[PDB]
Write a protein that binds this ligand. Structure first.
Ligand code: HEM
Length: 148
């Protein structure tokens, strides 16, 4: 597939500094959907402001975890059915923390933003299309965690 290669080459740029790029993803996410902020409940406390999230070591570890799952998806881009069972359970876990299926699109848009900003002119509409498909495949697996 030409899509597989576009994903791998774009990801190489990003995976060089995953927390820096992840931080972009999340900042953007909270700008688009501020109601996602309270779902992170480290020590039974809620962040007041998005910028609070950025000083929390647990929150930053969660960004690293995110980036690691996407990296797994990229590595398995040629066959993502091998991650299906993990992603389903990852879905279920997020369902339990109070994540809602409709917020997947915001996360998607946030991912695309981060890619668009990191790659600049290298973010071609075919790159965009490829990542949307990848992301969509991930969401479809995770969504099975809402079983139905
Ligand atoms: C964007 C909205 C999301 C929110 C609000 C959110 C929230 C959470 C929370 C509250 C936890 C539990 C505490 C912790 O481990 O830090 C968690 C765990 C996790 N999240 Fe997320 N998360 C989101 C998105 C994602 C996405 C898109 C992925 C992966 C692509 C991801 C991967 C993980 C992983 C790997 C864990 C650890 C799960 C476990 O094995 O226990 N998260 N997330």
């Amino acid at each position: 597939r030409p899509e597989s290669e576009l994903i791998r080459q774009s990801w190489r740029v990003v995976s060089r500094s995953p927390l820096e790029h992840g931080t972009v993803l999340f900042a953007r996410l909270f700008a688009l959907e501020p109601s996602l902020l309270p779902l992170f409940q480290y020590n039974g406390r809620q962040f007041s402001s998005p910028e609070d999230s950025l000083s929390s070591p647990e929150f930053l570890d969660h960004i690293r975890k995110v980036m690691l799952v996407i990296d797994a998806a990229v590595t398995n881009v040629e066959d993502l059915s091998s991650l299906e069972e993990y992603l389903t359970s990852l879905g279920r876990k997020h369902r339990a923390v109070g994540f809602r299926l409709s917020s997947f699109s915001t996360v998607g848009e946030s991912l695309l933003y981060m890619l668009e900003k990191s790659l600049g002119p290298d973010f071609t509409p075919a790159t965009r299309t490829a990542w949307s498909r990848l992301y969509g495949a991930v969401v479809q697996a995770m969504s099975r965690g809402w079983d139905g």
